[PDB]
């Protein structure tokens, strides 16, 4: 999630529309991302997740330089590609649906998650099509055709709360940042239609059924029990190991004798 | 060598009957049984350095 960056050029929030995402001197390193080990329900986790994505930029992207902005990784749960207009290619209540679906991941570019070490991917119900491919790497790029919509803001056109109508064109922009001053990065995409913010959400892009979010990825239900596989319960004492096993007892691996799921 | 652990002792067995054949009890005296043993066979004042 881009631990360094140069100081900025302007303090200003932005005023024109993207046209090539772009941040100078973006230098990005792999982090070990870790929550405390305890019994939680998802949205918790999620938020504990977020906090430690929030404490792994304070430790030491804040002090060098970040705009704050370009907080590469988060888990989420909304459906941003929702309420959008296929005009007017953005969403029309000027916010995000703030309803949970299912765990997300949102990524700047050049920003990447790795659950090649983890099984809470299993937790977030994000599963690789193919389980035993070495390597289960979310990248910025694995998430293309599902960038976020920009947001319609209500300043441009506001004739949906005057003179009687809710219907107006041509005068549709984006939110280009905040109420408090942070940006949203709204770019023009490569297809340069209409704007969109670089933030390839995963829900997004595997909701798009053409490629690679599809058929690279899974979504799934959550599966909060933890992703635990089978247990083994052994007795090299009292038990002939069965076909294939070695008499092994004074070990941990013993024969197996009872098999059962955790 | 961990003489007499049931909980952390040895294992000799052969392969074709891979049943393992040294049991070790707690209630036994291995240690011991090799001193008395030894000093029954010879003096003890020997200073055997191996």
Redesign the interface.
């Given at each position: 999630m881009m631990w360094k960056r140069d100081p900025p050029t302007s303090t200003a929030p932005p005023s024109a529309v993207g046209s090539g995402y772009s941040v100078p001197g973006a230098q990005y390193k792999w982090y070990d991302l870790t929550v405390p080990e305890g019994n939680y329900a998802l949205c918790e986790l999620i938020d504990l997740l977020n906090e430690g994505i929030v404490q792994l930029y304070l430790s030491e992207g804040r002090q060098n330089n970040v705009q704050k902005s370009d907080i590469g990784v988060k888990f989420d749960t909304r459906n941003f590609g929702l309420l959008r207009d296929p005009v007017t290619g953005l969403v029309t209540p000027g916010t995000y649906v703030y309803k949970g679906y299912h765990p997300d991941i949102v990524l700047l570019p050049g920003c990447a998650i790795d659950f090649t070490y983890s099984r809470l991917s299993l937790l977030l119900g994000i599963g690789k099509r193919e389980p035993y491919s070495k390597g289960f790497v979310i990248t910025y790029e694995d998430l293309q055709g599902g960038d976020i919509p920009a947001l319609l803001d209500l300043d441009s056109v506001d004739v949906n709360d005057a003179d009687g109508e809710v219907i107006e064109l041509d005068n549709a922009a984006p939110l280009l940042h905040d109420s408090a001053g942070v940006s949203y990065n709204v770019i023009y995409d490569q297809v340069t239609g209409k704007p969109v913010t670089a933030y390839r959400s995963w829900m997004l892009a595997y909701n798009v059924p053409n490629s690679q979010a599809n058929q690279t990825t899974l979504l799934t239900v959550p599966d909060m029990a933890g992703g635990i596989g089978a247990m083994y319960t052994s007795l090299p004492d009292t038990f002939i190991a069965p076909t294939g096993f070695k008499e092994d007892n004074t070990t941990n691996l013993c024969p197996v004798v009872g098999m059962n799921l955790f | 060598l961990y003489h007499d652990s049931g909980v952390?002792?040895?294992?000799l067995?052969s392969e074709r009957s891979?049943?393992?054949v040294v049991v070790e009890l707690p209630d036994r005296n291995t240690e011991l049984s090799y001193q008395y043993m030894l000093a029954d066979m010879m003096s003890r004042h020997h200073y055997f350095a191996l």
């Open positions: - | 952390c002792s040895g294992t067995n891979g049943m393992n």
